Structures are given as C-alpha cells and as structure tokens.
Amino acid sequence: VDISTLPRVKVDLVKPPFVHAHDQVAKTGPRVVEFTMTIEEKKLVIDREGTEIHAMTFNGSVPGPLMVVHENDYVELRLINPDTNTLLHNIDFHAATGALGGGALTQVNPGEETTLRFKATKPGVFVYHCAPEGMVPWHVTSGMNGAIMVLPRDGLKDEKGQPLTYDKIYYVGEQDFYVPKDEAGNYKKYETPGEAYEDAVKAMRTLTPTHIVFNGAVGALTGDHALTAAVGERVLVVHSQANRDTRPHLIGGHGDYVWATGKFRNPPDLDQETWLIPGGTAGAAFYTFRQPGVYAYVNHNLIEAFELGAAGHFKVTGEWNDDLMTSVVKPASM
Amino acid sequence: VDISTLPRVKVDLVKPPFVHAHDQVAKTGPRVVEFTMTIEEKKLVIDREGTEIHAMTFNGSVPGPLMVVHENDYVELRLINPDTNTLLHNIDFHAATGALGGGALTQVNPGEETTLRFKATKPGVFVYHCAPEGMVPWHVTSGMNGAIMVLPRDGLKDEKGQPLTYDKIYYVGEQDFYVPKDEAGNYKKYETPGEAYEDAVKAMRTLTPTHIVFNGAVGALTGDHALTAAVGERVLVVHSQANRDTRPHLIGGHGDYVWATGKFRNPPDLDQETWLIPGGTAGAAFYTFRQPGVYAYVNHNLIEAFELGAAGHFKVTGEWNDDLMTSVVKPASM
Amino acid sequence: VDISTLPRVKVDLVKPPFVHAHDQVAKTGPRVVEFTMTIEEKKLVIDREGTEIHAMTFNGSVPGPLMVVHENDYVELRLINPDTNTLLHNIDFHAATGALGGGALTQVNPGEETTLRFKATKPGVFVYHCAPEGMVPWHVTSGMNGAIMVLPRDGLKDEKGQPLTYDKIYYVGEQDFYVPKDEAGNYKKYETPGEAYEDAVKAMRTLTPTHIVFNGAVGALTGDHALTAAVGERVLVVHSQANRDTRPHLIGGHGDYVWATGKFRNPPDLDQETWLIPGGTAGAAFYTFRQPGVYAYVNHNLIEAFELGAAGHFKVTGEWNDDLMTSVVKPASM
Ligand SMILES: O=N[O-]
Ligand SMILES: O=N[O-]
Ligand SMILES: O=N[O-]
Ligand SMILES: [Cu+2]
Ligand SMILES: [Cu+2]
C-alpha cells in the first residue's frame, strides 16, 4: 500500500545502555517510525589516565542509540550535521537494502540535513555506522556507530517456537579505538582531524587497538552506572561491534538463548558460556538471573577486558540460592 | 563398484572469480572428475604502491581455481611442478580423507608431476592448499591455496529443505600477505626465496598482515573487473581464507542463506549482515539482489577492507525500488 | 532433595590429554562428585629454544585436568594453595551460576584451602580458570585454566537425536603465552612475579602471543606423546582456550559432529573442516577415523600452528582404504 496511508510514530532516542520504550509484540499495523539524530563531534575522555580523543558521534554518545522497530515497518531518519562540526558524515544501515545501506544518499556537510526512508524487511539486530567514501574506518573507529533492532511482529521465540519475553533490555556497544603512539609508546596529540588523519591510519593498520571500551570509556558501566536486575528477571542484552570481533561473557551467568550473529529467523543457541559476535555485527543474548550479587560482563579475551577496558558490571538484587552454589568450607589455613 | 567402470570427465579450470561450468543437480551417476593444475612461481604486484612479491600459485592465480564436483564423485588431480620453478610443492585437500589431505602423497620437486585420486565423501566448500613439511605457512601465505565445492547430488536446499538454485556463482579467495618490514616500516626486498625465508618467518610471527586482498591484489575486484549481477538474480559467493579469520559483508545487501563454515548437510543461517569464516575454511552465501547500483563486498574489519585491501565491488543493473529505500529529503542546508 | 542424602563419589584427576574414567550415560542418580586440586606454581620450559616461564597451574599441568560430571550433579571442589606458593589464587567455573563462577568464594592465600560446591545445571563443556581481582589475565595466561564437561544424563546425541558414543576422549588445552620482549626482540628474564608483573601487562597489551601451545609446550602432543587411535574408532576431542580464539583442524580428517561453542542442548554442526572456538570457551568434536597414518591436529591459523606451536599429532593404526584416497601416479619426472 501507499506509504502516506500508514501510521507515523515519532520516537525520541535515549542514551545507551538504555533503550527507548517500545512493544515487543507489535500493537499496530506496519508504521513509519520517525527518528532524528544530530551528529556531534566532541572531545571524550576514554580511560582512567585521562586520554582524550576527538570523538565522532551520533546524538552525542558512543555508541549511538539503539533504534527499535518491527519487521516491515519503515524507518525514516532525519540526520542533522550542524555547522559547528568540521567533517562530512553519512549513515549506512546494515538493516537496509540498497545504496550502500543508505550511505550513498545521506552524505551531509556541516550545516546540512537529510531524510532517508527504508523498509526494515529482515528481523534481527543490525549495526549502523558512518561510512564516508575514502574515510570509513576512521569515522567508525572514532565512535560513529550504533545499532538497530527489527523485532519480529510477534516478538522473540525460542528454539521450539514458544514466546520469549524480556523484562529489561540493555544495549552495550563495544568500541575499538586506535590512539596513535610514538616510538616510546606514548599517545600522540593533534590540533585538527586533518593533521590526525595519517597517524590515525598508521595506528589502525597495526590492527592492535589501544582501548576497547563499553559505552564510550573504561569503566562506563561500573559503579553508579552498573547495569541492574533482580533475581528472576529476564534481561536482553544487545551487543554490537562495528569493526572488530568480540566475545561477550557474563561472569557468573550464561546466555540462556543467544543469537550470536543477531538474526531472529534463526533458532537461538542455548546455554552459551561465551559467544562470538563478528566485527560488523550485532548480537543479542537473553538470560534469566538466578543469583544475586555483582556480575561482570566482559569481552572474554581477558586482556581486552581487564587491561584495555572491555568490562562492565551488573548489580543483581535478590535471594541467594545455596542449592546452586555454596561455600562448604570458607577459605582458611591448615 | 570398481573405479575403472565409472564415467570420467575432464574439466578445464578457469581463473577466479569465475567458476568452471557445472550442473548444480547431478545429471550423471558418480564420476571420476579429472583436473590438471600447473604450479607457477611468479612475481606479483599486490598493491597501488607497486609492492611486488614472489608469489606461489596453483595455475598462475591467487587464489587457485575453484574446483566443483558432486558428493561421492572421485577427484583425480594431476599436479605438475615445471622445471622453471625452484621450490618443492604438494597439495592438501580439506575435502579428502587420509594422508594429510593428500599432502603426504603429492610432494613434487621442480621437473616432476603426480596424480592423486580421492573420494569426495562430504558435501560442502573446502579449502585446498600447499603444505610442504617444515614450510607450510610460508607457501600458504604466498598464495598457494584455493577451494573445492562438493555439491550435494540433489543441489542446495534451504533451512526447510526446499531447492535453492543459483543463477551465478563467484569465488572470492581472500589472501593475508606478510611482507617483511625493516625498523623504519619499509618493505624489504630479497634476491632468492631462501634468503627471504627467515624474514618471512619473522613477519608471519607478528600475526599482523601487511596486505589482505581479494583475487590477488588491492582493487582486483573493482572497476572493469567488478562483479556483476541484475536485480532479481540469485548469486552464490564462495569465499575462502586458508590462514586467517574473515568476516564478509555485502554493503547494501545481506546473506539471505549462509553456510558460514561451508558444509551443506547443515541448515543455512538466514538473513546475515556479516558472517564469520574461520581461517582454514571456505564458506558460501546466497543472495537475491533487490536494488541496482554499486555494492561493496568487504571483510568487515573495515581497516582490513579499506586500508589493507579486502574490498571488491558489485555493479548491479536493474530497476530502483523506492518502497525499499528512498531519499525523502535530499542533503541540503537549513 | 537435601544434598546430604545424595551419593558422593570421589574422583582422582588425571593429567591432560587423558581424562579420568567416567560413564557417558549416567548409571546413578544425581551425585555429589568430589574433586581435589592442588595449586602448583613452577618453572616450565615451553619451547625448543628452552624458554622458561614461571607457570601457574592447577594440579601441576597446563592445562588443568578435565573434570567430568553429569547434568544436575553437584561439583564439590577442594582447592588447596600450599605454603610453598607465593600468590593468591581462586577458581571461576563457567559451568556454575553465581558469585563470579565461584571466584568470589574461593580466594586462597598460600597456606590455605577452600571447598566450593555448585550444581551443574547446564550440559556442555565449559572453561574454568583462576580469576583473582585485579590480576585476571596474568593468571589465566600463565597456565591457570582447564575445563569441565557436564554430560547429558543420557549421553551425547546427534542432530537427529540418536545416540553418539565415543570410544576414546582426549582433552587439548590451548595456551597463549605472552613472554615479555625487549627492543631487540629477546625474551626478558625476571627474579620474582612482582618484578615480572608490569612487563607481563605490557606484553599482554600487544595482543600478540609469543607462544601458542597444546598441553603446555611446543611439541607436547608429538612423538612418544602423540595421540593414538585405530581405524574405525570414535574419538571425542575436547578443546579449550580460556583467552583467545582458536580454530582446530584435523589434517586429513574432519569434525563429523562438532559443538563449536560446546553446549550439548544444541544440535551439532556436521562435517566441519575447521571450527571456531571463541576465547573463553570450550568446544567438542567427534570423529570416526577412516584411514591410518599420522594426522596433525592444529590451530588453522598456520602461523600459530607451525611457528608459534599450536600443533599436535595423532598416530592412527589400521587398514589403508584405496577407495577413499590413492596415489594414481607417484611423484616422478617427465
Ligand atoms: O560505538 N561503539 O561503542
Ligand atoms: O589465495 N587467496 O586469495
Ligand atoms: O591452559 N591451557 O593449555
Ligand atoms: Cu562520520
Ligand atoms: Cu558496515
């Protein structure tokens, strides 16, 4: 049918790791879902040492916000590049078909805006990212990426096709940064992005990230900003990596149902300890918490997690179950 | 039955990314399929800068040609090492059972030939590569690898077991090269392969390729050599990496049906954005084009794609579908 | 029911690649299975050059021993840290639920012991490793890891749900070591673990292992210590990597049935040439040998296998099958 006859809904995006309100099961027919994002180039402190980079962001955050729609909705994105920015940007949705995922049609100079519409024909979680010709990896590895979830119209289903319903959803975007180092191993500093570019390229070509972080910085998902849940709650964690493979693991838990490559027409993998999300992919894992306390959620290359930054915490409330685990003899001398 | 009573068919191989003519559904009983390959050691220019390596090839190309047979055919390979070559070579088929995939039985010095036969008992796409004792990774990372497709006798089937038929097939071999660098970062030059060997080994041990290319060189699958299709065509892309993990992605499309690890008795993964092909594996992805224009097919570590070379193009002809994607407001000022 | 009313069985662990005796199909009701492990910090020679590291081990071996239980058994582990050790240790089971896999409850100083019990609620093969707060990757990458197999109570089943029974089982633990190098590229030497720590951290942060080995050393699974089988035997190989992705391959064979991410409620992948086990995961592959002779089992990044050490051998006895493979014309001149 004619697109103009469809309902329109405007969505206001929220900062990761939170996700905008939506229904898992579609309560309306197919809609045009309107999103707006404003590009912001900004300084960001990415580690405990105070290393500061020039980040390139969708809507002021690394990662960009999680958009949520249903299969066969239309996504209409208004992308704004304000005059206070210096670079050309665009957007490629892996969820979309044609024109380099939209990138060929969304090139915006500072001071310009554009509106793209596409039909979300395939259910799953998908990466989106900036991809300006000749400079793709630089923009992506400076923070300019996020994800979109296209839910099946009747929600998520298990390996047997029975309903799976989540109580909470979180979005973890994992970012590999490549801060240029001198011969001594110190991080170089640059006046302008153009003076940064070649050294940025040389650093990228090492294929060795200097930092690998969740939600834009070392420790971003810890402390007061730890993820939360209660014993018995069903949590969906959507995890994306636009450029580099990752291997999420919940320390003390499991992925009860996992779409490691993120596409909901496939049956989920059951009972995973660790799962592989290839670079350029988003995945989703569903877990029901069974024990309280602190959990760490990590990239299980443990160097990547505990030295380069790819670690966050869940604080879980509720009853301790001694049947599942107990200290029989607490640590003591002999 | 006695092998001598079977039909024999001789196949003449073609240069990747093209594939020799074959039937998807087997029109004959089990056959002996005869292939011939001639080893050629040659200089190859691998990048825009004119970096020239001593390549080791099957049949003059990187990758070697795609062989296609059906499940329970016999593959009879005549491998020729002419006297103009300097090194010992052999061949290991991952499709074969026994004798290190044939490698124990096919060692040929310059001036020698050998004929191996094996039964293709398992359907799938499989790597083949050179593997001379004591020097395996050097030969493999100098170009000496390809793939073989063993089709099910009744062709490919979807996740529900209905027929899937491809209209075109392409073979992308992805090659990681490790050109030795000095302390300054320049590529070293060597008189003979023996003088090259240790520096080749040290470069390999960095685990950081200097180049990652499709069809033997940066830009080999672009421009006049872009892959082609039309809107509505069903295309199979077979992709191999003998040594290093890769993560293919069609920018602007999907893998509608994907055998990421390449073995056809398993149901395909549906609707993939990006898929992981482990080093030492061949995979296959089937896509029906729905939009015209240029597509890029990339390793979605984007540094690997756009800086080290792992990117090619499809040029697709046909009708633009405004329902699937459209520019609502073209990029403009405010 | 009350745990005290269950049967108890004490198991005596064996050195990898061998596995303690067990039944595939559970011959008793749910039990408490008692294991004891003693931490041993020791010097280990890891390569042909005689490079010696200070290893941190469970029970004196790298990897630690494979524990085998059935789904819904209880695992009771007595962990002993003798006074001859210098460091704090603990244990995290990926098989367990809660308290960081047990790590929060098992911290033992030299001279102390502890007993943990957990319920093995999920069938599969799982990593266990040391994880002391603030120093996780160092302990894990110094050898302190192993695996546990939780069999389904009715044993393993194929993709159709018919029984699969193994005749032999082997455990290959793959270890990535990061020996610190100076500016010249020589391996540094250290008096105490505390003087080693920062250089250990800097080496880890390169993300480039210096050694990647099976069973604790280059060539540990070769020669007199080669794995063995006979033609016709069904062999299960359990393979773990606590920190880094690997891609096992049996040269001359296949993975007939593969749980690449190791969890037995999922159907196995069939006919794999090579499979990906993500860092932080254990996998399992079942193969029936069809040809005699020497096989190599390798990480199929071939640099990792043949230069850094991730290669072992099987010696297989029995009848040669000329139908599956034969030399038609043995290597000769022209
Ligand atoms: O943008 N990645 O967090
Ligand atoms: O040989 N690989 O393109
Ligand atoms: O501990 N890994 O062999
Ligand atoms: Cu941008
Ligand atoms: Cu992309």
Ligand SMILES: [Cu+2]
């Ligand atoms: Cu060769």
Ligand SMILES: [Cu+2]
């Ligand atoms: Cu191989």
Ligand SMILES: [Cu+2]
């Ligand atoms: Cu320890």
Ligand SMILES: [Cu+2]
């Ligand atoms: Cu762990």
